[PDB]
Design a protein around this ligand. Sequence first.
Ligand code: JYQ
Ligand code: JYQ
Ligand code: JYQ
Ligand code: JYQ
Lengths: 261, 261, 261, 261
Amino acid sequence: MKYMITSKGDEKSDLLRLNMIAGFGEYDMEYDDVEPEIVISIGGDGTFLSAFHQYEERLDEIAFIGIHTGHLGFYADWRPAEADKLVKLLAKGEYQKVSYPLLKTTVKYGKEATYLALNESTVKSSGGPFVVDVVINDIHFERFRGDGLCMSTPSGTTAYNKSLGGALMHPSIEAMQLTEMASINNRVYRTIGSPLVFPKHHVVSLQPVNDKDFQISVDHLSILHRDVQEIRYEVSAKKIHFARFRSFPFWRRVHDSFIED
Amino acid sequence: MKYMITSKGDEKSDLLRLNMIAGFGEYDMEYDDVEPEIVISIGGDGTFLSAFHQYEERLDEIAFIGIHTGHLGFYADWRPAEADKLVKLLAKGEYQKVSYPLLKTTVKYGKEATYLALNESTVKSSGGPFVVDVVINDIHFERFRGDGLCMSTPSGTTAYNKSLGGALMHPSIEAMQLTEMASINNRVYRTIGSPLVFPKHHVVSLQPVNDKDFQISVDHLSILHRDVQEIRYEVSAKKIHFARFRSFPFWRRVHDSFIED
Amino acid sequence: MKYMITSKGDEKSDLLRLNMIAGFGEYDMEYDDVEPEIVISIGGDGTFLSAFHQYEERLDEIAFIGIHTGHLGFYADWRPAEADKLVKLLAKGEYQKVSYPLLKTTVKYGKEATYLALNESTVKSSGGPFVVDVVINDIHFERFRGDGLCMSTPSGTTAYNKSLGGALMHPSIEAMQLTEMASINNRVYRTIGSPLVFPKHHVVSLQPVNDKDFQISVDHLSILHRDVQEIRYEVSAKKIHFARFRSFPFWRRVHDSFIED
Amino acid sequence: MKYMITSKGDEKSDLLRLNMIAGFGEYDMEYDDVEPEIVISIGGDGTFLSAFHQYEERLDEIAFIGIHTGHLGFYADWRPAEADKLVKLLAKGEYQKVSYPLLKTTVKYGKEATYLALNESTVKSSGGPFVVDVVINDIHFERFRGDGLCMSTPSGTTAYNKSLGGALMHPSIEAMQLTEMASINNRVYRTIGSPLVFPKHHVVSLQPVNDKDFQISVDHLSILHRDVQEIRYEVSAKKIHFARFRSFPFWRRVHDSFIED
Ligand SMILES: CC(=O)SCCCCn1cnc2c(N)ncnc21
Ligand SMILES: CC(=O)SCCCCn1cnc2c(N)ncnc21
Ligand SMILES: CC(=O)SCCCCn1cnc2c(N)ncnc21
Ligand SMILES: CC(=O)SCCCCn1cnc2c(N)ncnc21
């Protein structure tokens, strides 16, 4: 079918890309980066992340695969030595697919901007103090004062979420996790401190109290948003689809990354 | 129908119990503590916890209700002032029911002991060092050295799990969360550190490496188990059922308990 | 002697300032904000902080006093009701003095910039990834990857240091404390994680590895430094001097701020 | 002079001990384990710890040395390959000495028991809930509810203190550090959460509120104390003295243990 391959840019990934294309030519496979049904990433997790956001409007028609030319990645979890065997099974197809949940971020002004995050979305102030009111399902939960907040996807918990004390949750759980950055707590300012895991259809809303300028990141993308009235977080109805070739469990992927390999 | 009421034991809860029984007599309600269909707890969360374990063999036939004669509880979340209104709606029934997941703990020796936990189950050593191998779905994940481990239900995350840095997760998420107690980490001994959230059907297994004596707790119950070969944790197929009378959201219950009320 | 009074700017602090000046006129006291021997701050801790940095070149000749017109402060720890009694004892003098250690920050380029911090000094990247090599007494200790680092004075531990997990240490201990911001740790990148308390004469040096642009803060001041070769942290030889009128222990000041009051 | 050598018990340490004794016989050195002036530990940190407590009544007349026959230790910080060179310099003496602060623990009943801790002293309940009032310099600071508390020496911060989130402080700082174990915090029960570093002459006192039975540990020693009225913590006036042969900085010892070696 139609496919395309993105490369990190170094000669290790570029040469590995040219070989897979040459191997794909031996099969009924057409190269198309406009309407691909298979998107192959070669490099690391950031390369897969750019490949995800490059085609985040055709997610239901794409099965992603990641190849790590460096250290192991949670998305690029196939070594370069399996590139030739990957070409054959992708060519004749018949592969199983696995789907991970995604995070929807809605930014409201005085239009409306919506984003799709594979890892996480963070909110920080524009330099001044970061104070925000946290509203969970139209219920005022807390007034957060600190460095910022991070809402993470299940697969994104192994990234920035983990550095903030958040829990690692299996990606089959359709949920999102909110963690704090350097919250100030005294007798007068109260935050929950613990990470918060939210199921599907739960809407977490950040609302300003003073400054309406915030630095909002979505995976690698980061923009300074001005005159914002609300930031809405919820589990997205769309899912990223992977091509599954063999058993590489998420917990084994966690063990190899943080324990030993 | 058949009902029964447990009391904390103080005169505040005993008198509140006698009044609800007198009010129940004005309706088609029979008092039965052998086969009750309604179990009312009056006191706090520990009173509800003892009421849960007293009838943990008829969970599919019971709708629990908790009344807090002291501070607010996550299970006893109805004030004493609503006792009379609670009697009327329970009498004519028609109430909706909500179900929370439970934790199954299997202890294997050289028979087999299984427990049901509403909050959490902890494992500590018998005084000596606590070293254990953590196996996730038959995959050796880590060798844990420290004070102990805690596997928490979703509703149990607000209890001992929260004191260990674990995340608070909404009880509609059928999952369990594992947290560490004072793990020792150097270049030679590696633990994940982060809490781990496991979905349904995932089996987390603790296996000894030296001492086979461990102090295992299940909610309030705590026993010294000797000559144990394995501790199996997984989300239980059974659920505790509550009687629902009005909207008291879990996140509002979290806000009232830790933020302010 | 010579004195001056800074005000937060609100009418509560301005009127309290005009009254103390009028009360000071009843004594042998001259108002001088060029060479003051007594510096009175009226407002909060940020007002005292601006008053400290306004006169950080005559620290050995000044005894500072802080008055909080709002909530209690660790530097402005005297209520407005004690302003009149404060005027009398300052006028005839005979007051005891207490001294807190300070933090010296040296920034080396390709000249040299030195700063004095009463609370803390933080280092973050200019937007990109923050990677830095931590050198303790000319010994390479770790390569830090994360959001940034914070070196705190003893009295500064109750501020941003506390939000990062650092310990609160009594200000009589001439030392400094280093804490991490969202460090990334795996099998390949290793940080200590724990806070580090350094005694006097110990030099902690941050050295770039890639980007040489960092956002460095010193108390409230924050500047983007470009083409930096080294950031040197050490306990300063200079001390801030307070005027002591009665027993307000630091631990009682910690209790009143975070436990209850 | 007079010396003695303790061994871990394995054949690696016993044979290394017999060789140093044979090498000591070539010099003006007498073996005496009653009144030794040099105490050599061969094994790990627990072997040095037992050697410390074996002679904790002649601390001012002993210079300790630790040899690690296994992984590196913070007290046994000399490899077995340096045993012969260690024998020669100890024999002719002229070595410099370094001193680390110690922790004094006073347990008051209805007599009085005092202990000396090289690493830390912990307090836990006897099985029931652990609630205690924390009094700092006769000022009620907090009511602690949780698993327990740990007061650590400076050199002890790399041990159990580190697993509880406490800071690592250089041993030249005469101080002690208090850390919490799984404290419960809500709107009604308030603990500081942060670790607390106390200078010399500051007295931290734990006082019961209900149960007067606590499991108190002092380094490796652990005893169940009954009918206790007070636990007093303070920096001891006595110091443990080491024999210094070359530069092995504490921070390098921290780097080798937790970063890499
Ligand atoms: C410095 C930080 O805290 S973000 C590190 C990002 C590394 C690349 N990466 C991208 N996605 C992931 C992921 N899901 N899990 C771990 N690492 C990931
Ligand atoms: C000292 C500790 O860490 S356990 C405190 C237990 C208080 C009673 N309780 C019982 N169940 C719960 C619950 N689910 N959420 C919060 N509190 C609960
Ligand atoms: C949002 C943060 O983490 S910084 C809060 C700073 C409040 C004012 N202040 C200034 N100095 C201090 C101090 N030493 N101790 C506590 N608070 C202080
Ligand atoms: C499982 C724990 O948290 S205690 C581990 C004790 C290891 C031996 N040891 C004894 N003293 C020390 C010390 N000062 N620094 C590190 N390790 C030490």
